[PDB]
Amino acid sequence: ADTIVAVELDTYPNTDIGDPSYPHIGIDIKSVRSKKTAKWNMQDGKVGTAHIIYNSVDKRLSAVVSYPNADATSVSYDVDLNDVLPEWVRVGLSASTGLYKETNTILSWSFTSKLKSNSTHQTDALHFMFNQFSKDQKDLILQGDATTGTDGNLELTRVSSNGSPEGSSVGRALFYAPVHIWESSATVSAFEATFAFLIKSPDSHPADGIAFFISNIDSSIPSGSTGRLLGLFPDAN
Amino acid sequence: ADTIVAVELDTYPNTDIGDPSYPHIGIDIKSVRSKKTAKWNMQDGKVGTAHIIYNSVDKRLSAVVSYPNADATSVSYDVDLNDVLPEWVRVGLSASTGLYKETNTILSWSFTSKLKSNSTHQTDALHFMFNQFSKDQKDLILQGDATTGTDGNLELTRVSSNGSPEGSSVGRALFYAPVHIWESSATVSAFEATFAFLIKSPDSHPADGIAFFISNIDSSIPSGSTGRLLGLFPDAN
Amino acid sequence: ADTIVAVELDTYPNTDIGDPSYPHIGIDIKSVRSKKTAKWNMQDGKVGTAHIIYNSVDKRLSAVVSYPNADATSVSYDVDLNDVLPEWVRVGLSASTGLYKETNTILSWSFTSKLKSNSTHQTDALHFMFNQFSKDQKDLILQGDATTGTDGNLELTRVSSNGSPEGSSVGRALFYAPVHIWESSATVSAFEATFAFLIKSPDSHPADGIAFFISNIDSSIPSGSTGRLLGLFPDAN
Amino acid sequence: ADTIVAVELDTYPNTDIGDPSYPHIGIDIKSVRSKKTAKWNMQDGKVGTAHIIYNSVDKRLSAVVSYPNADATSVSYDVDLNDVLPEWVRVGLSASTGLYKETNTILSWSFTSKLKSNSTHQTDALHFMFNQFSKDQKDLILQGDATTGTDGNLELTRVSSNGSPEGSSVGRALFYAPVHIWESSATVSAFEATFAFLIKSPDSHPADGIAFFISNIDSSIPSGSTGRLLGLFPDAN
Numbered sequence: 001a002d003t004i005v006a007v008e009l010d011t012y013p014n015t016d017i018g019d020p021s022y023p024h025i026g027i028d029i030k031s032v033r034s035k036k037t038a039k040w041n042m043q044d045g046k047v048g049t050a051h052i053i054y055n056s057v058d059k060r061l062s063a064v065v066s067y068p069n070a071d072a073t074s075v076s077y078d079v080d081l082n083d084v085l086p087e088w089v090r091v092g093l094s095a096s097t098g099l100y101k102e103t104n105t106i107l108s109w110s111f112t113s114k115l116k117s118n119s120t121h122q123t124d125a126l127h128f129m130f131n132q133f134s135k136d137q138k139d140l141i142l143q144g145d146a147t148t149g150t151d152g153n154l155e156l157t158r159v160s161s162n163g164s165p166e167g168s169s170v171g172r173a174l175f176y177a178p179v180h181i182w183e184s185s186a187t188v189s190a191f192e193a194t195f196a197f198l199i200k201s202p203d204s205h206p207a208d209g210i211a212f213f214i215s216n217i218d219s220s221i222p223s224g225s226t227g228r229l230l231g232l233f234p235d236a237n
Numbered sequence: 238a239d240t241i242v243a244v245e246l247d248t249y250p251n252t253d254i255g256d257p258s259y260p261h262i263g264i265d266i267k268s269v270r271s272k273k274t275a276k277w278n279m280q281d282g283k284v285g286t287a288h289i290i291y292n293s294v295d296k297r298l299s300a301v302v303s304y305p306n307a308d309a310t311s312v313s314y315d316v317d318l319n320d321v322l323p324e325w326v327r328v329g330l331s332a333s334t335g336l337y338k339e340t341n342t343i344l345s346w347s348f349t350s351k352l353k354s355n356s357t358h359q360t361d362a363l364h365f366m367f368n369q370f371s372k373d374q375k376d377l378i379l380q381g382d383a384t385t386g387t388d389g390n391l392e393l394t395r396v397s398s399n400g401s402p403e404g405s406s407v408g409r410a411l412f413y414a415p416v417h418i419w420e421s422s423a424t425v426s427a428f429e430a431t432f433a434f435l436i437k438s439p440d441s442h443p444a445d446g447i448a449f450f451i452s453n454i455d456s457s458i459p460s461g462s463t464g465r466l467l468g469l470f471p472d473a474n
Numbered sequence: 475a476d477t478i479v480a481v482e483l484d485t486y487p488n489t490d491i492g493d494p495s496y497p498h499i500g501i502d503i504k505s506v507r508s509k510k511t512a513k514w515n516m517q518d519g520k521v522g523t524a525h526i527i528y529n530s531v532d533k534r535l536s537a538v539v540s541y542p543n544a545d546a547t548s549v550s551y552d553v554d555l556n557d558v559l560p561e562w563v564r565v566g567l568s569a570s571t572g573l574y575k576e577t578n579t580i581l582s583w584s585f586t587s588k589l590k591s592n593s594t595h596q597t598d599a600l601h602f603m604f605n606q607f608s609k610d611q612k613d614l615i616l617q618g619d620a621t622t623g624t625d626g627n628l629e630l631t632r633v634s635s636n637g638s639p640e641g642s643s644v645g646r647a648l649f650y651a652p653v654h655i656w657e658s659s660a661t662v663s664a665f666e667a668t669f670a671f672l673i674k675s676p677d678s679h680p681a682d683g684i685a686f687f688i689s690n691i692d693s694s695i696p697s698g699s700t701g702r703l704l705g706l707f708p709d710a711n
Numbered sequence: 712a713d714t715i716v717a718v719e720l721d722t723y724p725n726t727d728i729g730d731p732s733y734p735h736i737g738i739d740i741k742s743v744r745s746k747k748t749a750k751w752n753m754q755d756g757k758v759g760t761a762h763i764i765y766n767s768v769d770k771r772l773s774a775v776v777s778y779p780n781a782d783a784t785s786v787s788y789d790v791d792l793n794d795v796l797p798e799w800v801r802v803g804l805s806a807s808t809g810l811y812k813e814t815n816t817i818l819s820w821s822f823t824s825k826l827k828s829n830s831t832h833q834t835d836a837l838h839f840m841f842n843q844f845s846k847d848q849k850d851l852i853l854q855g856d857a858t859t860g861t862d863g864n865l866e867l868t869r870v871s872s873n874g875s876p877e878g879s880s881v882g883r884a885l886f887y888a889p890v891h892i893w894e895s896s897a898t899v900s901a902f903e904a905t906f907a908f909l910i911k912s913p914d915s916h917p918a919d920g921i922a923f924f925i926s927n928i929d930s931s932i933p934s935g936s937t938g939r940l941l942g943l944f945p946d947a948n
């Protein structure tokens with residue numbers, strides 16, 4: 001009733017769980033215990049951009065977190081979303097804070113996803129494009145402390161009037177229209193997403209990080225999703 | 238609180254209103270009293286396909302209802318949706334029946350729509366692709382007697398087990414995610430849609446017709462939307 | 475100077491090479507000796523549709539040849555196009571005949587391909603859409619006996635005035651604009667293509683088959699590309 | 712044999728022709744004598760972005776040249792490209808210099824274009840995406856002094872090693888694949904393009920300007936296309 005696949009950006013390495021010793025990216029299937037991990041070179045206060053693709057033919061969850069001038073960090077995990085995700089899913093954004101401070105602002109957001117059938121070709125599909133959120137932003141489902149329009153951006157985490165990334169925070173947002181994972185006569189399916197993000201830390205010990213996650217249209221933030229729980233996974237591991 | 242712009246397919250010409258004397262297409266702004274009209278050559282039991290575009294620069298509501306081998310029928314009206322539609326709209330499908338019988342089945346359905354901002358370029362946008370509806374069809378909002386999956390199609394109107402188009406009927410359906418008409422820093426906006434439809438009449442006196450309409454996320458079928466009221470307009474004219 | 479990756483549709487099983495004992499699909503890297511194979515259930519005179527995807531993160535050449543009502547046939551091979559294809563490639567269509575007769579008509583043709591950079595996001599990319607070829611068809615590069623506009627279709631192989639698939643034939647066609655495989659600051663690349671095809675055989679012993687292939691902008695049909703050589707590979711194996 | 716429709720960015724107002732008295736934008740059909748004009752507020756050394764759309768239903772050439780924080784400048788002209796452009800066209804970029812200096816660098820470039828037929832729906836079409844040009848840039852046709860990869864950008868005009876916009880210059884570039892304006896069974900056609908540009912002037916008296924133009928696959932720069940001739944129109948007016 002509340003299951004999710006997440007692609008997470010980890011700034012604050014919680015050794016106690018199983019994350020490497022520095023900032024890392026990887027795939028989480030069912031829990032905080034990411035299945036695959038990788039090391040990315042944090043650039044505090046710098047502009048970033050994430051990417052993520054997959055499909056049934058191959059069924060391989062892959063990611064690419066890039067930085068300008070800086071070199072690429074990727075990770076790939078083999079999994080059957082067919083077996084994991086609800087036939088119909090929802091797409092949103094999560095970011096987190098707790099003891100540590102950090103900014104979680106989204107500049108641009110893009111989502112592509114299609115479904116190939118038996119009939120002939122070019123069956124079903126959907127796209128959502130973002131470069132600036134509004135005070136309106138009505139085809140979006142925000143959770144908790146997310147803020148849209150702050151500075152004309154999707155700000156997952158709590159911010160002040162001067163910047164000052166707040167702590168002990170948590171919220172998220174998902175596109176209105178559900179998504180279609182797999183189907184009766186579908187033999188070739190696909191998903192594509194990219195997203196620029198902006199993490200800012202006055203501290204050298206930045207918060208927790210960000211995260212792009214897939215779950216049920218019903219997905220809700222659990223208890224103390226705060227902290228390293230990036231509001232993707234309850235206390236279970 | 239319940240306003241709409243509609244592109245309608247009129248099979249049953251109700252002289253009493255203002256529709257020409259044979260089947261016609263045109264633009265309806267606020268009421269049944271379509272603003273522009275045109276004559277299209279009905280092909281009962283044959284496969285059809287509608288199209289419709291517009292934008293602010295130009296602000297001209299235009300349409301093209303085609304038939305294979307058959308020649309094109311188009312109509313164009315000058316209007317300010319900026320002035321008419323809610324800043325945030327919804328996209329759906331309507332078809333109608335009353336004293337007259339006719340089929341209103343959708344084979345394929347496509348929706349494209351984008352928003353150009355000041356920042357730089359390629360700001361906001363969305364796409365929805367359809368070639369076959371499901372028993373599921375969960376990212377769709379159906380109204381009344383619409384049926385999804387019947388034969389793997391979106392069937393706006395009431396059908397029997399042998400075909401037999403039902404009469405005195407009415408229903409519709411809209412994509413889940415709202416749409417974004419105009420905005421703060423948007424100076425160049427656009428909308429694009431095409432759709433194949435299938436109207437079937439055992440009778441020579443076919444029902445009412447079909448209709449592609451834009452309204453509020455709140456849009457609901459009025460009283461006796463049945464008949465020529467194609468469930469787009471209440472009794473007001 | 476003349477290298478290619480091909481996704482081929484094999485109707486006429488030439489045991490002497492290494493193809494299974496019935497019609498099959500698979501990946502060919504450098505030669506006729508396809509690297510991966512699979513069994514698809516031919517439906518002579520019936521409408522078909524092929525699909526094919528891949529990318530660097532994963533680097534896995536995958537395919538899906540479907541038939542309506544009929545079940546799916548797929549194959550997947552792990553390869554480094556980065557290491558194989560010219561930084562800049564060309565996209566076309568090949569089909570073949572020799573001792574055996576068969577039809578090789580294309581109804582629809584679709585090509586999607588993009589390149590993700592370091593700068594920010596949504597870097598480079600291209601699309602080409604086909605549902606009917608012309609007597610014109612000017613942004614297409616046809617080779618040999620291919621015919622465009624015959625019946626408003628791309629007909630790779632030689633046809634008569636009554637149908638009568640010709641034999642001992644060979645030709646192909648590619649989109650004008652070159653394609654961009656990999657690049658300096660590209661860390662996330664992708665390719666997507668689908669295509670409906672129509673193979674017709676008065677005989678029970680149909681020709682050779684079809685094939686979607688990637689090569690150099692310079693790609694030319696070799697000697698006796700005819701036969702099982704599907705005009706993709708010279709005599710080398 | 713050499714005809715063109717152009718959307719031009721005019722920095723250097725040549726009163727002697729018919730351009731207003733300050734920088735302006737407008738539509739040129741057959742000649743320098745733009746048919747429609749409008750006033751845009753130049754921002755030297757600042758980042759800009761142009762847009763342009765049209766189609767048969769409506770047949771209205773429209774444009775939007777925007778600047779960040781700054782307000783929009785648009786122009787619209789009614790014309791029959793069906794009657795003017797070759798059934799098959801080419802898409803490129805032009806910029807100009809002469810007595811006056813100015814920079815003409817392109818950051819991003821985007822092209823969308825489709826063709827609706829009788830068959831059913833979603834007939835033909837093409838897309839080209841740009842955010843950074845290469846030393847390679849092989850699916851592009853550059854003319855004269857255009858430079859690709861200079862700083863990872865398409866630089867239409869002649870630049871030095873320190874910047875120093877050169878004078879008395881002229882060149883352009885077009886996408887490889889031709890374009891399809893109108894056709895046999897096409898009743899609903901469309902074209903869409905946006906583009907960010909960067910004009911830089913050490914002087915207060917900047918060169919000539921930029922220009923997005925449509926012509927024949929054969930289009931070549933005429934004599935002294937230099938100057939206000941923005942290399943779009945020969946000496947004829």
Ligand SMILES: [Ca+2]
Binds near residue numbers: 228
């Ligand atoms: Ca952690």
Ligand SMILES: [Ca+2]
Binds near residue numbers: 256
């Ligand atoms: Ca009527």
Ligand SMILES: [Ca+2]
Binds near residue numbers: 484
């Ligand atoms: Ca063979």
Ligand SMILES: [Ca+2]
Binds near residue numbers: 725939
């Ligand atoms: Ca001038």
Ligand SMILES: [Mn+2]
Binds near residue numbers: 010018019034
């Ligand atoms: Mn972790």
Ligand SMILES: [Mn+2]
Binds near residue numbers: 271
């Ligand atoms: Mn009417």
Ligand SMILES: [Mn+2]
Binds near residue numbers: 493
């Ligand atoms: Mn073989």
Ligand SMILES: [Mn+2]
Binds near residue numbers: 721729730745
């Ligand atoms: Mn001028």
